Amino acid sequence: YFQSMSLQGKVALVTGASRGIGQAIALELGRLGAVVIGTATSASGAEKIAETLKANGVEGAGLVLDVSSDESVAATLEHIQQHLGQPLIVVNNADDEWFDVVNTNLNSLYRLSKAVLRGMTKARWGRIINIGSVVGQTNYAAAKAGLEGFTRALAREVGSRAITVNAVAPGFIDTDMTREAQREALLGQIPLGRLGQAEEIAKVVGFLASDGAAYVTGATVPVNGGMYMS
Amino acid sequence: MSLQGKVALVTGASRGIGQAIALELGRLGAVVIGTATSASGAEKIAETLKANGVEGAGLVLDVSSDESVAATLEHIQQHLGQPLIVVNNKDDEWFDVVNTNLNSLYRLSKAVLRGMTKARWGRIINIGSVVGGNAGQTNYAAAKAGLEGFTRALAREVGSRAITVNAVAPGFIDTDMTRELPEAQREALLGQIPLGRLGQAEEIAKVVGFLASDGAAYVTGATVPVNGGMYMS
Amino acid sequence: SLQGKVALVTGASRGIGQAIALELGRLGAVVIGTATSASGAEKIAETLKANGVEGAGLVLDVSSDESVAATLEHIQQHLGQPLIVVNNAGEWFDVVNTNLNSLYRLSKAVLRGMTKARWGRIINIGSVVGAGQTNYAAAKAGLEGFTRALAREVGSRAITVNAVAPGFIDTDMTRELPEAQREALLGQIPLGRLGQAEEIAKVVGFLASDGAAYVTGATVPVNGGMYMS
Amino acid sequence: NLYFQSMSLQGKVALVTGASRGIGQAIALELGRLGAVVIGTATSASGAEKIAETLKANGVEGAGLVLDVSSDESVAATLEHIQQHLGQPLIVVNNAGITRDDEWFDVVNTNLNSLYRLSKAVLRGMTKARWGRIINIGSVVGNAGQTNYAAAKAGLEGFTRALAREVGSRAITVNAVAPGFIDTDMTRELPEAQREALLGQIPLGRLGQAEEIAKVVGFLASDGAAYVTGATVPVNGGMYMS
Numbered sequence: 055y056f057q058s059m060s061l062q063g064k065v066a067l068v069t070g071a072s073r074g075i076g077q078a079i080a081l082e083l084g085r086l087g088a089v090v091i092g093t094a095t096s097a098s099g100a101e102k103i104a105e106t107l108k109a110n111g112v113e114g115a116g117l118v119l120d121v122s123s124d125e126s127v128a129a130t131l132e133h134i135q136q137h138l139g140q141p142l143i144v145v146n147n148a149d150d151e152w153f154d155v156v157n158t159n160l161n162s163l164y165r166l167s168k169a170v171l172r173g174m175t176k177a178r179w180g181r182i183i184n185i186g187s188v189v190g191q192t193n194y195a196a197a198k199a200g201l202e203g204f205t206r207a208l209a210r211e212v213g214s215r216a217i218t219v220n221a222v223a224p225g226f227i228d229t230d231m232t233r234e235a236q237r238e239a240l241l242g243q244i245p246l247g248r249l250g251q252a253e254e255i256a257k258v259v260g261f262l263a264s265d266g267a268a269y270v271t272g273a274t275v276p277v278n279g280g281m282y283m284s
Numbered sequence: 285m286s287l288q289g290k291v292a293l294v295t296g297a298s299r300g301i302g303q304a305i306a307l308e309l310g311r312l313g314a315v316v317i318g319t320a321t322s323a324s325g326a327e328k329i330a331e332t333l334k335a336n337g338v339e340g341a342g343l344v345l346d347v348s349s350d351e352s353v354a355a356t357l358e359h360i361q362q363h364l365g366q367p368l369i370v371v372n373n374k375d376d377e378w379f380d381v382v383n384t385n386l387n388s389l390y391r392l393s394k395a396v397l398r399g400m401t402k403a404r405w406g407r408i409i410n411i412g413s414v415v416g417g418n419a420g421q422t423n424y425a426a427a428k429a430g431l432e433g434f435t436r437a438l439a440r441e442v443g444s445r446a447i448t449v450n451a452v453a454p455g456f457i458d459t460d461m462t463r464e465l466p467e468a469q470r471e472a473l474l475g476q477i478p479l480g481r482l483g484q485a486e487e488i489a490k491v492v493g494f495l496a497s498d499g500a501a502y503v504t505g506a507t508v509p510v511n512g513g514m515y516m517s
Numbered sequence: 518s519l520q521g522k523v524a525l526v527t528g529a530s531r532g533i534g535q536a537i538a539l540e541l542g543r544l545g546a547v548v549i550g551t552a553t554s555a556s557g558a559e560k561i562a563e564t565l566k567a568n569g570v571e572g573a574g575l576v577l578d579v580s581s582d583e584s585v586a587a588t589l590e591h592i593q594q595h596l597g598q599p600l601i602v603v604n605n606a607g608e609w610f611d612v613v614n615t616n617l618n619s620l621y622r623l624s625k626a627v628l629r630g631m632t633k634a635r636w637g638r639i640i641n642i643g644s645v646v647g648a649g650q651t652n653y654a655a656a657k658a659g660l661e662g663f664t665r666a667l668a669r670e671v672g673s674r675a676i677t678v679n680a681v682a683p684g685f686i687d688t689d690m691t692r693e694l695p696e697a698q699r700e701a702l703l704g705q706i707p708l709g710r711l712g713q714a715e716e717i718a719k720v721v722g723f724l725a726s727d728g729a730a731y732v733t734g735a736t737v738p739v740n741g742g743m744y745m746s
Numbered sequence: 747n748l749y750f751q752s753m754s755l756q757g758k759v760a761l762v763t764g765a766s767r768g769i770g771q772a773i774a775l776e777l778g779r780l781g782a783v784v785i786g787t788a789t790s791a792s793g794a795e796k797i798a799e800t801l802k803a804n805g806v807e808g809a810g811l812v813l814d815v816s817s818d819e820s821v822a823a824t825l826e827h828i829q830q831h832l833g834q835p836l837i838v839v840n841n842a843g844i845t846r847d848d849e850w851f852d853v854v855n856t857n858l859n860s861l862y863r864l865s866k867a868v869l870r871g872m873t874k875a876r877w878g879r880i881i882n883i884g885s886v887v888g889n890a891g892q893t894n895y896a897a898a899k900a901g902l903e904g905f906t907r908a909l910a911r912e913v914g915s916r917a918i919t920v921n922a923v924a925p926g927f928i929d930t931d932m933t934r935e936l937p938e939a940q941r942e943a944l945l946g947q948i949p950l951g952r953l954g955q956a957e958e959i960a961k962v963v964g965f966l967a968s969d970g971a972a973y974v975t976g977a978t979v980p981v982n983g984g985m986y987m988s
């Protein structure tokens with residue numbers, strides 16, 4: 055069984071896949087025919103991922119991954135390699151506290167990315183896609199700027215191996231967090247005048263994972279209905 | 285992904301990136317109207333569409349004139365329907381040229397908006413210039429900045445009607461323009477591109493295809509760079 | 518020190534323009550301020566005099582080639598070549614385009630003089646924060662790009678071109694916004710206060726100086742930390 | 747008797763890291779010229795002593811001190827020493843550095859920890875005064891080379907914008923200066939062909955002087971720049987490189 059202009063037979067790793075945007079990315083990739091490995095930081099979350107994938111007919115697995123630790127990352131990859139193959143699509147979705155958070159997130163992004171690159175180097179093919187945070191404002195803006203820069207820098211480091219690195223900057227998305235006066239205030243700031251759906255973020259990620267986006271790298275695609283806050 | 289039963293207008297469709305956008309949209313099932321500034325170009329567009337099985341038309345359009353624009357839309361409306369996907373593809377040229385081009389973008393966009401307002405649906409996608417000295421670069425950078433800003437502003441003006449407005453900033457693409465830059469200048473550019481290769485016209489078309497889709501309904505005001513990792517400010 | 522330099526400031530009869538006029542005068546330039554009416558031009562002259570600034574009030578309409586050309590030759594004749602020019606002048610599409618034509622028109626006119634001198638300063642003042650967002654953001658992007666492009670075109674002649682992007686400044690426009698809307702804006706500004714006109718003038722003053730000779734094509738935001746793209 | 751001085755930073759204490767040569771030294775001398783008491787720092791005793799002798803030769807009141815921005819103990823001790831002998835530093839220029847595979851990540855993130863560390867330490871003093879100036883100097887201008895340069899610049903801009911938001915309400919401004927191609931002892935010794943190559947990229951068609959960076963810093967330290975915060979002022983003669 056051999057494939058053409060699809061994600062068929064590709065193994066995709068999606069962190070933070072148990073709810074909201076991560077779950078939708080997991081499902082969209084599966085719908086495009088990838089083998090999807092979703093991760094959570096707990097056993098119960100990893101089980102819910104496996105059951106969700108199964109209910110949507112997606113071949114894959116739920117796994118426990120803690121992106122903040124080198125041992126958890128190394129072990130998880132060797133497990134995946136042994137059972138399923140090398141993951142060549144990797145989606146990193148997992149006031150005055152802004153510095154630590156952003157730094158921590160970037161260490162995890164780096165750590166995971168560096169681990170999965172040996173595989174992708176070997177294949178001369180890969181996709182790394184980073185999901186930024188949903189829309190206090192100081193943290194949002196710092197996060198976004200660190201994510202853009204990180205994505206642009208890593209893209210440069212791994213371009214020559216035919217690995218794209220890209221990011222998706224979501225705006226105001228309908229997730230369990232965001233679900234009145236404050237709600238109407240936000241809708242006034244969004245040109246389309248509506249919240250985004252999780253699936254709308256997934257669609258962009260799906261496209262970036264495809265062969266049609268092979269010349270796109272280092273980019274951050276904002277998916278925010280026209281609300282730009284930097 | 286499906287654009288079935290949608291009418292799409294692509295300006296500058298006779299070669300290179302425009303042609304590929306015309307064919308990709310057709311491949312996704314849109315009725316494609318391609319335009320050129322001459323009758324012979326417009327006829328080549330019709331023959332190219334036919335050879336790829338794409339229903340559509342070749343038409344003569346001069347984006348710089350109100351009469352040409354108004355007439356062309358009426359002709360399209362009469363024969364095919366409202367276009368709801370529209371792809372816009374001597375001193376101090378960094379000012380005059382650029383500002384003239386933004387008037388064309390604006391002129392065309394304003395003309396096709398009545399149709400999209402009526403439908404409560406639309407896609408406007410602007411294609412910026414390909415990379416291709418000293419006189420060169422000031423113009424290139426002014427064009428790119430004007431396109432981003434224009435796109436962001438218009439997206440705001442027409443958001444509430446469920447019309448997205450976006451732009452694609454290509455990098456170094458393999459087209460007839462760029463094949464005939466001197467080899468030294470070509471090799472210089474390859475050194476600056478992380479993927480270490482020229483982009484294909486089809487790679488631009490794919491992005492446009494996605495932006496035209498329902499999957500990109502929450503993307504507006506954006507400029508998607510498609511440049512293999514080469515970024516220029 | 519801007520001593521022995523002639524500086525042209527458009528829109529100098531109130532608010533930010535007036536303050537730029539006074540600051541430049543305070544640094545020792547001869548200041549020519551402009552307004553679109555004779556009574557405004559007279560008020561400029563009386564203001565300059567009350568602050569001990571040598572200069573003039575003048576009627577200028579930046580939107581017309583005849584008004585621009587005539588005004589420069591009148592200045593050249595009486596005072597010398599203006600080598601510091603502050604453009605504080607001038608549905609979103611037409612407006613922004615019009616403003617950029619005025620910028621261009623005036624800049625091109627005063628470049629001959631600066632080329633001759635092998636020295637010059639052009640400083641563009643963008644709009645203050647008051648559909649509302651759309652015009653502001655388009656204006657700002659057109660100003661940055663324009664400034665960046667012209668800086669490239671006139672760099673080799675030792676002319677700098679820069680821009681100042683003000684945030685929420687205390688001027689006659691913003692004095693008339695309802696207190697609830699005012700307090701809302703103050704929440705979005707880190708320094709938690711409106712800016713003064715003089716604070717804009719201080720930046721322009723520095724940009725006009727010799728100390729800023731290596732700064733060109735820049736846009737300096739003066740917005741107390743409130744940033745919008 | 748006793749000479750009062752009429753200058754724009756008179757009676758302010760200014761800390762400048764990495765002050766023993768190049769841009770740091772020039773910032774130290776410019777701030778002194780504007781009348782501040784200047785404390786310059788180096789990572790060694792012999793560097794700190796050269797700073798003192800330089801300040802003295804230019805008639806600047808101040809001190810050379812040993813500081814290692816990468817360590818909390820060195821930072822804390824140095825501030826208390828300064829507060830004890832000279833007063834609270836209310837102008838702080840971060841011009842000390844970092845480096846000692848992926849340097850575009852590790853180096854950059856380490857430097858931003860130093861910036862944050864130092865900035866947090868000097869904020870108590872500035873909070874107390876209801877006044878302060880923090881100014882960060884970015885790096886002066888291969889393929890890997892350019893990756894580092896662009897990451898550094900983007901991190902510095904974002905950092906500066908974020909900290910400005912955190913400390914605005916206390917009347918502390920936080921700003922950055924992004925230098926371009928500045929003239930230094932390394933660049934004076936490049937062959938003319940390599941020199942001319944660089945000058946082609948720069949509209950003003952000339953290298954910048956260290957003093958030209960210092961002038962911008964001097965202005966940002968002033969009361970005239972009280973409404974400017976969160977900004978990065980590029981001082982690159984028009985060469986805009988990302």
Ligand SMILES: NS(=O)(=O)c1cccnc1Nc1cccc(C(F)(F)F)c1
Binds near residue numbers: 156855898905
């Ligand atoms: N070196 S990198 O790839 O991680 C990177 C590349 C580009 C820009 N920033 C980067 N890092 C960064 C680290 C901590 C805080 C921030 C801040 F949010 F303050 F802006 C940014």
Ligand SMILES: NS(=O)(=O)c1cccnc1Nc1cccc(C(F)(F)F)c1
Binds near residue numbers: 378386658
């Ligand atoms: N050619 S130029 O120097 O004036 C110029 C240089 C750089 C960017 N924009 C420019 N012009 C411009 C003209 C009309 C509308 C806009 C818009 F605001 F929509 F982005 C921009």
Ligand code: NI
Binds near residue numbers: 595
């Ligand atoms: Ni006369």
